[PDB]
Structure formats: C-alpha cells, structure tokens
Amino acid sequence: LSKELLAEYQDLTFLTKQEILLAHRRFCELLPQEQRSVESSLRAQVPFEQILSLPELKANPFKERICRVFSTSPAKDSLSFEDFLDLLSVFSDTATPDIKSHYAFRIFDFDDDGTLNREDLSRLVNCLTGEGEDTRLSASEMKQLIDNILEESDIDRDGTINLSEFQHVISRSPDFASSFKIVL
C-alpha cells in the first residue's frame, strides 16, 4: 500500500454527499455568510487559521506535517475542508489496522522521507511525554534506550526502522505494541 493508491481514494471516493452537505454548513458559519455561494465554496479553498478552529487535530505535535502530507496544494498556503475533514472522520473509526499502520508510519516519519531514525522515535515518545520539559529527552540514556530496543526487537540492527520493521517492532513486544493503541 503506497501513497499512490491512497491518492486515488482521496480523489472523489472519500467525499460523500451527506457529510459534505452537513460539513459545508458547519464550515460556512465560520466563513462570511455572504459567501454561502456553493459555486464559490467548492471553487474556493479554506484559510489555514480557519482550520485551526479545531484544537482536535491540533493536539498532534505535527499537525502541520499531518495536514501537509495528507492535504494537497500548490504553494501549500491553503487547506481544503474536504481532505481535512476526511482525515478526521477516517481517523475517527474507519481507522482499520491496515490503514492504521500505513497512516502511522507516514506520520511517524518526521522527516516524511520514509525511513525512521533514532530521532523520529525520540520525537513521538517525547512529544507525547510532555513537550517542553527535561522529561524523556534526547540524551545518553535515551540513546541506549532506542538502541537496546532495536537490538532486542530487530536483529539486522540496521540502525533504523522501516515500514516492515515498524509494523513488527511495534507489535513485536509489549513495548510500543500496547501503546500502539491510538497515535496521531
């Protein structure tokens, strides 16, 4: 499951009629009531801040990467309520074990490159711990922490975790396996 097939679903398969009609009304109130024109709403995008009106996805230490990666735009200066809302609803329940990992591995990779480094792992665990504190932070102790986990989990000790290794390593030991419950 590559980012390709996913892009195909994002096209015009994740956009229903009832959800779009109802969602449009909700996003309409936030926007000038005078511009209630549909030909303008569907032909026009929604400001960035306008989206921030949902502290929900904000709780995500990387709401910028999740939206940018999940959303699509030319200069990435605008955000559509379609993809944005789709991400929420999709990650609300549709979040199936399969799409769960795929989405994760993608969001987990802070570099958004594909592979995962010791830092990426120190970001998800830290950020969640309590961003802005001496708590679980990158250091000598945290250095041997990831290494030890990689050795106990993966053998190739490639020094990094890929998609295949991510799905396993994560669900290979009560470690992140138990915490793998819900992440975003």
Which residues participate in the annotated binding site for Ca(2+)?
109, 111, 113, 115, 120, 154, 156, 158, 160, 165
Could you give phi then psi for residue 79, rounded to 5 degrees? -135, 135
Contact 166, 160 (CB under 8 A): no
Member of 102, 165, 167, 170 binding Ca ion (CB under 5 A)? 165
Could you give phi then psi for residue 55, rounded to 5 degrees? -50, -5
Could you give phi then psi for residue 62, rounded to 5 degrees? -135, 45
Per rule CB under 5 A, is residue 158 in the interface with Ca ion?
Answer: yes
Q: 173-182 contacts: CB < 8 A, separation 24 or more?
A: 173/149, 175/149, 182/95
Site residues (CB under 5 A) for Ca ion, limited to 62-121:
109, 111, 113, 115, 117
> Which is nearer to Ca ion, 23 or 66 (by Cβ)?
66
> Which is nearer to Ca ion, 82 or 154 (by Cβ)?
154
Per rule CB under 5 A, is residue 154 in the interface with Ca ion?
Answer: yes
- Contact residues: Ca ion, CB under 5 A: 109, 111, 113, 115, 117, 154, 158, 165
